[PDB]
Structures are given as structure tokens and as C-alpha cells.
From a paper:
Kif7, a member of the kinesin 4 superfamily, is implicated in a variety of diseases including Joubert, hydrolethalus and acrocallosal syndromes. It is also involved in primary cilium formation and the Hedgehog signalling pathway and may play a role in cancer. Members of the kinesin superfamily of motor proteins (Kifs) move unidirectionally along microtubules (MTs) in an ATP-dependent manner. Kif7, a critical regulator of mammalian Hh signalling, acts as both a positive and negative regulator in the Hh signalling pathway but performs this role differently from Cos2 in that it does not interact with Smo or Fu.
Despite four point mutations (Kif7E226K, Kif7R268L, Kif7L269R and Kif7H295N), the overall structure of the motor domain remained unchanged (data not shown). Kif7 contains an eight-stranded β-sheet core with three major solvent-exposed α-helices on each side, displaying the characteristic arrowhead-like structure typical of all members of the kinesin superfamily solved to date. In summary, the structure of human Kif7 resembles that of human conventional kinesin.
Author numbering: 9 to 104, 112 to 202, 209 to 229, 240 to 257, 271 to 344
Amino acid sequence: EEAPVRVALRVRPLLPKELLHGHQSCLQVEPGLGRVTLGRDRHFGFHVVLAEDAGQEAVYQACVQPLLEAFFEGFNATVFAYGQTGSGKTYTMGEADEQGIVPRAMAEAFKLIDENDLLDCLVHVSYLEVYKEEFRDLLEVGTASRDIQLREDERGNVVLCGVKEVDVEGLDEVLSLLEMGNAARHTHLSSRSHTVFTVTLKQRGRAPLLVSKFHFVDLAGSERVLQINSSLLALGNVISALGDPQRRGSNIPYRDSKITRILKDSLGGNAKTVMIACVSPSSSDFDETLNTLNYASRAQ
Ligand SMILES: Nc1ncnc2c1ncn2[C@@H]1O[C@H](COP(=O)(O)OP(=O)(O)O)[C@@H](O)[C@H]1O
Ligand SMILES: [Mg+2]
């Protein structure tokens, strides 16, 4: 009935391009100790640390599978990928073998539905982009931003008005929708916008209403030019508050951004949340890697 935000760090390999430009790793990663060392003497610990050799299935098992279980119990869940552009958020979240979190979680969801034969289940999905505090519905997109509203009901549940929700019965249908949403996003950068893929599960007793939501979010790139003036800083403020024993029982400032408002019922409290902080090990990215390590640390 209450749980901390779980923070996972994912370190990707140094990329060919980075190697060819003369860069080398500035991170020593110790997965079994749950920790990393930046440069010579900057040490950071996280709930889960995944090294460059951790494959997609390993990330999914470490970070996401336990959310999937709470989702079917009727808890809300979110997994978000955070980090600078180029760090591996999209690769990790898998919405665009090498398949990422979304296809694996959806594959498992439909198997669970098949297994729970005493429940009658309905699943629908929405797929939204947030850019400069305006929504675009990627499954419609003929939808004016002004016609999508984010509200909250009396029981604290987030209510979307004007967003397309599509019933799905299998992974094939989910993959098809993701392909079209991703096509629709282009015909403004993907690294300056957030995307939110929301899966809603409605379960009723007898013969395959408890309602839960699982959000999969691929956040805007965290890089900075160098107080709360950005959606990433609003999200960081919220997760900081939740992780702070003095602040966590006080008023959590969800209202500051659309991203924190849409996740309000699915971020800490009674919901289960995992942040996957993605980092480049490249020495060329030292400063942004430090920024992400520090941001992720504030959530613990
Ligand atoms: N864990 C990983 N293993 C191998 N390649 C990766 C990994 N993470 C990211 N990459 C690659 O690094 C590049 C940037 O990844 P991407 O997912 O686009 O990052 P972001 O979404 O954070 O900008 C892509 O070419 C991607 O294939
Ligand atoms: Mg990306």
C-alpha cells in the first residue's frame, strides 16, 4: 500500500562513432554492488545497476516485470527512461532480441490475460506526445492540442479528455499502432519532446470493475545549456519530494507540468514506479553523465 520510486541505472556500450572520435569510457560499473564510479573518485549507488553487457531481456526482468505483476493486481505503474540524447532511452523503452521494454511487457500482459481465466479483461492503449506543454495524439493527430485536456477526478484518478483509446487483443495489434504513431510523429525534435504510451487494463470477475494503468514514458533529452522552468525539473522535484522523508508526506507539486499531471496517480504513493536513468560512458559526455547520476540520486 506504499512503495519507493525504484531507480535503475543503465550504462550503454561506447558506440563505434565515439571510439573513432578518440573517446573512451569514464565509468567503472559494478552491477553486483549496485554501483558505479565516474572518473577517479565519484561513487554512486542505485537500486539496480545494469552494465553495457546487460541485454534487453535482462533490463526487462530487472526493472519492469515486477511492475507488470502489480498492474494486474490493479495498481498503477510507470516506467520512464531519463537521460541525455544519445544515452539509450528509446532503445531501452522499445516503442520505436533487440526489442525493448514495451513489446516484452505487452507480450507478457496478453499471456497473463490468457492465464487468468476467471477474469474478463479489456485492454486499450493511448499514445501521446508532449512538447512545450501541448499534447499531440499520435493515434489520431487530426486532434488539435487545445482539444485534449488533462483533468483529475474526486478520487484522485487522472482523467484524459479528448485522447484516442484503442482496444487491443494481441501484441500484433499493439505493434501496428506503435508503428503508425511513430510514423505520425514526423509527418520539432523527438529529443525535445516526451512520449507517453499508456495501457489501461479493466478486469471484471467471471469469464475471461478493477482498472489500472501502465505508462511507458520516453522522456525528452536531459542535456542542459548551463527554478522549476522545465518539465524534467518539475518531474525531478516531484520524485525528490517522494524520496525525501521530510517532504514525502507533504503536498507533492504535480501541477507544475503536464508530464507530472498525467502521471499523478501513477507516480509513487500507492503506485509502482521505476526510473531507468540511461547514461553514455563516453568521456565526451562526462558532464551530462554527472548531471544524470546526480538527478537519479535525488530520487533515492
Ligand atoms: N544498451 C545499448 N546497447 C547497444 N546500443 C545502444 C544501447 N543503447 C543505445 N544504443 C544505441 O545508441 C544510439 C542512441 O540510442 P537512442 O536509443 O536513440 O538514445 P536516446 O533515445 O536517449 O537519444 C542508437 O544508435 C542506439 O541504437
Ligand atoms: Mg530517443
